[PDB]
């Protein structure tokens, strides 16, 4: 018979949503099984829904969205066999048995849930899109017959990728955050264009060598050392190899279509192989063992560059990079920043923890909105100990004005431009600090540092 809306849909937030779908005024208004069969789609995301009790009566649903709610039970879906697309990411679903017979599904999105058992998916052979990442899946057996899949993601405990053998239609695969070391099966997925394998245990990438249609590859956070196989993948435009143990970059030298290359957190001391990758706009080389960055002078299209946490003394090869917008090189050994002076398109400069004493070359970088210059530190060349040592202050702000020491060791004092100590007896060093707020464009920072003066006996 004609029931009230809120006795079908027992969940308060869904009752209220269905009221609006059905063109009614209150959630107590009654509706017929005919008013219900009018409803073929339902966008009910982020509405705080806890239960979909009532949805079984919307027999003609072809497409639903219940993402970003608090669903646990999805039994109401069991017999809505006209469903072709389900979006239900970001809930608390564990049991997906109710999906087992919805064989007309072409799209199923379930990432960010609590699913372990995916056996109920095994007969959904019309799926071309299946998203299962950020779940607790360890066994992907049930996938072996879903041969029409073009996009697939899953996590987060899979070791055995063999069930993927016949999924040869796959173009996009995300196996991020699993426990995979053996990727032999991926040799069979020759139509892959995008492979995301962040955060696994992969050391042998030989299987990828014939995946020549890959344009996007991430092996971020794996166990890579030898990357020789990547030389085959000449269609790559986007490559992430960050957080591995890579030192030899020769295999990348011919990958001239690369516009993005992430190599941070590796064992790299020679970037000569990168010299010909002139299409690069983003290059990340933080957390390596770099000193010589001369090959970077050829990469004229670079807009973003990271070099932080390296052993770099001379930054000057960057002077030709006129399109640079972001440059992070904190924690290096740079003293002279005169090579940065004509990089006027920089809006973000992060140069703390260097050996910078003179900011005057930064004065015309007026598109800066973010700036970091703290915690500089250097050691002067030793001078011979005597009771009265004085050294010049060389610390200059963006104006060219000397910055007066903030602290001076061993009771010393300052009379511009000189710092003077009176030392009773031998000490093997003196020091001073400086600390001054500075603004360049609209970016504000503390320019601070410690200068050490060794004293020889």
């Amino acid at each position: 018979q004609d029931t009230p809306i809120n006795q079908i849909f027992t969940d308060t937030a869904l009752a209220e949503k269905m009221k609006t779908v059905l063109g009614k005024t209150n959630v107590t208004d009654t509706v017929s099984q005919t008013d219900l069969d009018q409803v073929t789609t339902l966008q009910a995301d982020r509405l705080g829904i806890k239960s979909i009790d009532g949805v079984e009566y919307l027999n003609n649903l072809t497409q639903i969205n219940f993402s970003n709610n608090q669903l646990t039970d999805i039994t109401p879906l069991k017999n809505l066999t006209k469903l072709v697309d389900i979006l239900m990411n970001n809930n608390q679903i564990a049991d997906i048995t109710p999906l087992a017979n919805l064989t007309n599904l072409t799209g199923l999105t379930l990432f960010n849930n609590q699913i372990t058992d995916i056996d109920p998916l095994k007969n959904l052979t019309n799926l071309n899109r299946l998203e299962l990442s950020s779940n607790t899946i360890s066994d992907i057996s049930a996938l072996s017959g879903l041969t029409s899949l073009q996009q697939l993601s899953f996590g987060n405990q899979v070791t055995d990728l063999k069930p993927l053998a016949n999924l040869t239609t796959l173009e996009r695969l995300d196996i991020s955050s699993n426990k995979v070391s053996d990727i032999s099966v991926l040799a069979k997925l020759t139509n892959l264009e995008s492979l995301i394998a962040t955060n696994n245990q992969i050391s042998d990438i030989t299987p990828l060598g014939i995946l020549t249609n890959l344009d996007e590859l991430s092996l971020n956070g794996n166990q890579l050392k030898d990357i020789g196989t990547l030389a085959s993948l000449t269609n790559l435009t986007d490559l992430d190899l960050a957080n591995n143990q890579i030192s030899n970059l020769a295999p990348l030298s011919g990958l001239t279509k690369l516009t993005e290359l992430k190599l941070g957190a590796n064992q790299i001391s020679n970037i000569s192989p990168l010299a010909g990758l002139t299409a690069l706009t983003n290059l990340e080389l933080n957390e390596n063992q770099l000193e010589d960055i001369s090959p970077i002078s050829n990469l004229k299209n670079l807009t973003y560059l990271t070099l932080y946490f390296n052993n770099i003394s001379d930054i000057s090869p960057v002077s030709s990079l006129t399109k640079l917008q972001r440059l992070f090189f904190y924690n290096n050994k740079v003293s002279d920043v005169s090579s940065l002076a004509n990089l006027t398109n920089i809006n973000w400069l992060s140069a703390g923890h260097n050996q910078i004493s003179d900011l005057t070359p930064l004065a015309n970088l007026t598109r800066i909105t973010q700036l970091g210059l703290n915690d500089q530190a250097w050691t002067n060349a030793p001078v011979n100990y005597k009771a009265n040592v004085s050294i010049p202050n060389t610390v200059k702000n963006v104006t060219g004005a000397l910055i007066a020491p903030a602290t001076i060791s061993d009771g010393g004092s300052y009379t511009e431009p000189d710092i003077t100590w009176n030392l009773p007896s031998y000490t093997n060093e003196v020091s001073y600090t400086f600390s001054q707020p500075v603004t360049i464009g609209k970016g504000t920072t503390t320019f601070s540092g410690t200068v050490t003066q060794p004293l020889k006996a």
Epitope: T198, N199, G221, A242, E284, E287, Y308, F309, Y330, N331
Partner: nanobody, 121 residues
Framework: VQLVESGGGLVQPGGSLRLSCAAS????????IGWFRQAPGKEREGVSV??????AYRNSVKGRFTISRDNAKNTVYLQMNRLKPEDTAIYYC??????????????????WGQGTQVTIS
Amino acid sequence: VQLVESGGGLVQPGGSLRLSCAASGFTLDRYAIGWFRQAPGKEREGVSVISDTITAYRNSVKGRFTISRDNAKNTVYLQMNRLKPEDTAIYYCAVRDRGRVYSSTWSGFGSWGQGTQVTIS
């Protein structure tokens, strides 16, 4: 990802203390590891960071503190010498994923431990 700080205590001005940041449930090789501290009514502030073998230190502790790792023990240490009253604080360790990019030495840290109280009389 679980971090545990220990080694805090009461110490005389000019004295020394060694903190340990013991990590369990993940390889420390995948993370940069940072020591932070927070004094009463102040912001939590970075003290030192190690990423692989490269280290960084806030100005006020340069020359006095040394961060180091024992990879065998999955532990990061902060050697604090010539301690001053200004170094009084609860000391915390945290990590950040070395596979990302960060705009500063101190940004992006998380998985904070319980902390260890350092008091200089």
